């Protein structure tokens, strides 16, 4: 499936988006630590599993 950067981002709230602007990409000088997300990456799923 044609991938889009960030776009649809589940498994988080808006706290993670405090540094993920109107593009879902990381800020212009953030303090990322431990296990946060740099850039959003979306990918489709599957037939057999639905």
């Amino acid at each position: 499936g044609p991938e889009e950067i960030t776009a649809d981002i589940p498994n988080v709230g808006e706290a993670a988006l405090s540094k993920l602007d109107e593009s879902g990409i990381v800020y212009i000088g953030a303090e990322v630590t431990g296990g946060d997300i740099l850039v959003g990456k979306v990918t489709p799923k599957g037939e057999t599993q639905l």
């Binding site: 037939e47 057999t48 599993q49």
Partner: protein, 49 residues
């Protein structure tokens, strides 16, 4: 195990025991049919392989 899309990511362990048995049942079939020697014995060749 199923693969995302509609295929299979299976380890050939299955695809060999399936062979051990495809050939095996075909062999017992070939004996109820009572086929000639060298042919059903060529089947035992495939059984040992």
């Amino acid at each position: 195990v199923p693969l995302d899309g509609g295929r299979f990511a299976t380890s050939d362990l299955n695809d060999l025991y399936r062979r051990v048995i495809n050939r095996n049942n075909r062999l017992k079939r070939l004996l109820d049919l009572a086929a000639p020697d060298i042919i059903v014995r060529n089947e035992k060749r495939m059984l040992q392989e």
